[PDB]
Structure 1
Amino acid sequence: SVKSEYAEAAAVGQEAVAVFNTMKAAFQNGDKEAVAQYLARLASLYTRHEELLNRILEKARREGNKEAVTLMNEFTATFQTGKSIFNAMVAAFKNGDDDSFESYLQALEKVTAKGETLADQIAKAL
């Protein structure tokens, strides 16, 4: 069901959460080769999560589930904020700008932490 597709998408997000916190440790420790690999792994996870979310939203639309569609539109918008912050973090790593990288990492944690009370609302709405 759309609900099980959501629990599958939620797990992928929690995989990115895990890798992100591991990546933050490697950055703090100066293990740039680890960071590079973790950033690639995060890109693939965010691309997978985004595709799953879009399928879930499209299903809710086709099912006429207006409340789920509303919540998924809000959640997908915030998801794209994170994607932009993430992509800015990746560019800062390429450029050797640790100041920006730190900044973007905190910003991404905050945008992520905020968009969680909604993530639980969507699980109940589908």
Structure 2
Amino acid sequence: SVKSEYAEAAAVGQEAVAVFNTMKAAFQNGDKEAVAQYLARLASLYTRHEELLNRILEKARREGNKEAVTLMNEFTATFQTGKSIFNAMVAAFKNGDDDSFESYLQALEKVTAKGETLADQIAKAL
């Protein structure tokens, strides 16, 4: 169902939250080799997350679930913001620039926290 696929998407999103917090600790500790691996894992998880979100939105469209489509359009828009910030964070890591990395890390936390109001509304609309 669209709802079980949303539950999987929610789980993959929580996996990313878990890995992101482990990465933040590693960055603070200066374990750059660990950060590199966590960043690669996060990219993989965001790819899978976005794939699930798109299939859910396309299915809500085919089902005519107008409230769900509206909410998912809003959420997938904010997901792109998070993606853009994550990409800039990765570039800052490649460049050896911890100041910018810190800033982007913090910004991505705020984009994600703000998104959770939408995420929970979608669950209840589907």
Fold match, TM over 0.5? yes
The one-character-per-residue Cα deviations of 1:32-60 (angstroms, maximum 9, x if unpaired) are 00000000000000000000000000000
Structure 2: give runs of 5+ residues left out of the alignment: none
Q: Which residue of 2 aligns with 1:36?
A: 36
Equivalent in the alignment of 1:15? 15
Give the superposition deviation at 1:4: 0.5
Count of matched residue pairs = 126
Q: Percent identity?
A: 100
Any gaps of 5 or more consecutive residues in structure 1?
A: none
The whole-number CA distance in structure 2 between the counterparts of 1:68 and 1:46 is 21
What's the TM-score, normalizing by structure 2?
1.00
Cα distance in 2 between the residues matched to 1:24 and 1:90: 13
CA deviations on 1:44-103 (whole Å, 9 max, x unpaired) are 000000000000000000001100000000000000000000000000000001000000
**TM-score (normalised: structure 1):** 1.00
User: Where in structure 1 do 4 or more consecutive aligned residues deviate above 3 Å?
Assistant: none
